[PDB]
Each structure stands twice: as C-alpha cells, then as structure tokens.
C-alpha cells in the first residue's frame, strides 16, 4: 500500500521506479566518490553461527551477538533486550538505505524524463 | 443427567402454560376441559396452544398428531407416551 502505487498505476509508469529492475542507473552516476558497504561478520563466522541464508545480510553481527546472548542466559528469556534493540536498529538503518535507493532511482528517472523532453523541444525548435 | 419427568410434573407444566394463556379463564380451567367445546377457542387458538407446549417441553408435535389434542389431559397423555413416562 502507498501513494507510489497510485502514481505508477494511475499515472506515469515511465517516471516511477520498477522494483523488479531497480537499479537502472550506475551506482556512481552523480556520486563522485562512493564508499562500499562494510561487512563485519565473515563468511566462516556466519557459517559457524548457522545463520539462515536470508539472515546473512549486513546486520549479521548483531544477530550473532543476540544468539550468543540468548544461549548464555537461557532461563532468563528477558535478558537480551539490548542485543535485540541493536539488531533491530541495524535492520532499521538497512531498510532506510533501501528507501534512499528507491528515492534516488525515482528522481533520477524523472530527471532523465525532463532532460529528454528538453532535448526533444530543442530539436523541434 | 436431567431429572426424569413425571405425570404430575407434566400436568403441572401444561396447566401452568394454559393459565398463562389470556383467552382461557384460569378459574374454570380443568384437566378435562375441551379447548372448543367448553372453552370457546378455535383452530388457530389450538395451533398456538400446541406451539406453546412445544416451546415448553422442547420438542415438536407433528401436525397429524397435534390436531387431535383437544384437552390438557390429552396433551399430558401424548407427552408422557412420547417421553416414556409411566409414573
């Protein structure tokens, strides 16, 4: 649900992003120097922790810490609130980065539409 | 589970319903009174009386049988026979 669905369906699907094909612009297009994401947990550490393949994202170190916390304080199932919050906050930051990627895709698409309209008008005139 | 029915209990309940009927005078109502010969009701009144008894005892009297029960004693005998009441 959301207004983006209304914009894409009852509107300009060419200006709205396509979730199954995003991104369509180069990651450095408009970013002069862009840094790669940092991964804390290593492949061997995630493999040892037996993280689910969908849980082996960039937040996996907080998940590993939460699992270790819950194992050690077993009878007290209410003792890993801080580890749970750290994992949840890392997931929140990852999600807002996904939202930023979507918004960048949207305004890049509409900038391309404006540029091509300007070129078309210049060619016509 | 539930207490068994008795002839006196069935009689009491049928006469109770009939005394709560407005078109029947409770003073001249007896267990042998006829609904139309000496109470002055009609067929629709008898239908409503039988339906009231059905609601009272929680079971249904088929139309073939209900059209003949013209007496509180007849109703008592019918219900006792259907419920296997002998005392």
């Amino acid at each position: 649900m959301g207004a983006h669905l209304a914009r894409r369906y009852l509107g300009d699907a060419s200006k709205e992003p396509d979730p199954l094909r995003m991104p369509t612009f180069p990651p450095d297009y408009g970013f002069p120097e862009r840094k790669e994401r940092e991964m804390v947990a290593t492949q061997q550490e995630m493999n040892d922790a037996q993280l689910m393949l969908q849980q082996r994202d960039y937040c996996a170190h907080y998940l590993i810490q939460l699992l270790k916390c819950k194992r050690d304080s077993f009878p007290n199932f209410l003792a890993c609130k801080h580890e749970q919050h750290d994992w949840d906050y890392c997931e929140h930051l990852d999600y807002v980065k996904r939202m930023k990627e979507f918004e960048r895709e949207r305004r890049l698409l509409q900038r391309k539409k404006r540029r091509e309209q300007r070129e078309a008008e210049m060619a016509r005139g | 589970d539930a207490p068994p029915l008795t002839l006196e209990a069935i009689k009491d309940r049928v006469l109770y319903v009939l005394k709560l009927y407005d078109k029947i005078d409770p003073e001249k109502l007896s267990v042998n009174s006829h609904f139309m010969k000496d109470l002055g009701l009609d067929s629709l009144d008898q239908v409503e009386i039988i339906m009231a008894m059905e609601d009272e005892f929680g079971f249904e009297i088929p139309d073939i049988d209900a059209e003949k029960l013209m007496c509180p004693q007849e109703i008592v005998d019918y219900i006792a026979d259907k419920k296997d009441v002998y005392e």
Binding site: - | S43, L44, V47, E48, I50, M51, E54, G58, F59, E60, P62, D63, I64, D65, E67, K68, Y78, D81, K82, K83, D84
Partner: protein
C-alpha cells in the same frame, strides 16, 4: 406419527399447517421474544382478516398466494428442535435401540444374572401367545370385504382381549435406551 393419515388434507388442515409453519419461520426471523410476539399477532391478524370467507374458490386462491409468499420469505436456516427430523440430535440414539428378540438369544448365564426380569418377560411372552388368535379373528371380522380402506386399527371390544397388533407398539425400545 402415532396417528394414521387420511387420503387427503382438507382446506382447513392446509390453512392451519401454513399458519404454524409461518409462525415458526417468523420466530426464526424475529429472534427476540417481544419482536416475535408483535409480529405473530400481526400474522394472526391477517389470518383472522381472511377467516370468514364463503367463496371457497377465493379461499383456495388466497391460500395459494400465501404459500407463494411464504416460500419467497421463508428463513433459509429455520430453527429446528434437536430431536426433530432436521435437528442436530435427530436419530442419535438409534444405534442404542435393541429389540427384545435380540434379548432372548442370551446365554443362560447372562439370563441368570437377571432372574426377576426374565420371569416378567416370560409372563409377557405368554400374554402375547394367548391373544394372537383373538387378535387375528377380530381383525378379519371387522374388515370390509374389499380390504382395509385406511391404516386405522380397532380397540379391544371385550373385557379379556387386547388391541390387535399391539406387541411392537407396546414393546418398542425406549427413547433413551442405553
């Protein structure tokens, strides 16, 4: 159930059956007792309005239109008493109904566990055997030469007899057998 049916239903019988069915379905629609009382009185008002009608053709047409109205306005899921044919408790205790002929195949030890019951049962069996000839004779004396025109059965006309064809009616299994 207990009464033998006739060849046809009279107009009055049809009207009364429609009255009862209509009141039951109205009660199914009108769940609450006060609302049911109100609309039941209105329904009886309609029946009493058409109560006095000499033209039987008009009376039959009124009944036909009332039946059509009922079929259109009937409750899809009318209330049924649990023990009634459509009910939830209908025929639940049929697997517990066993006959007395099934009773007499018992082993002698089993019958020895109930000495007093089986003495009374033997008395009942003797009573049944002593009356069968009188019952069949009474049945064949009172029938018309053509045959039985209805399913009704006569009572016992004498001080020592029993109503013909009584055994299974009298000894039918109890409504709550086990």
């Amino acid at each position: 159930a207990f009464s033998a049916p006739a060849a046809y239903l009279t107009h009055q019988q049809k009207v009364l059956r429609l009255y009862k069915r209509a009141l039951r379905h109205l009660e199914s629609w009108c769940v609450h007792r006060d609302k049911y009382r109100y609309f039941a009185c209105l329904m009886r008002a309609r029946f009493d309005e058409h109560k006095n009608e000499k033209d039987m053709v008009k009376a039959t047409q009124l009944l036909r239109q009332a039946e059509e109205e009922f079929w259109y306005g009937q409750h899809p899921q009318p209330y049924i008493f649990p023990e009634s044919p459509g009910g939830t408790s209908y025929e639940r205790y049929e697997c517990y109904k066993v006959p007395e002929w099934c009773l007499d195949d018992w082993h002698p030890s089993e019958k020895a566990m109930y000495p007093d019951y089986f003495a009374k049962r033997e008395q009942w069996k003797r009573l049944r055997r002593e009356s069968w000839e009188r019952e069949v004779k009474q049945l064949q004396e009172e029938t018309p030469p053509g045959g039985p025109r209805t399913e009704a059965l006569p009572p016992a006309r004498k001080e020592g007899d029993l109503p013909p064809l009584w055994w299974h009616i009298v000894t039918r299994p109890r409504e709550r057998p086990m």
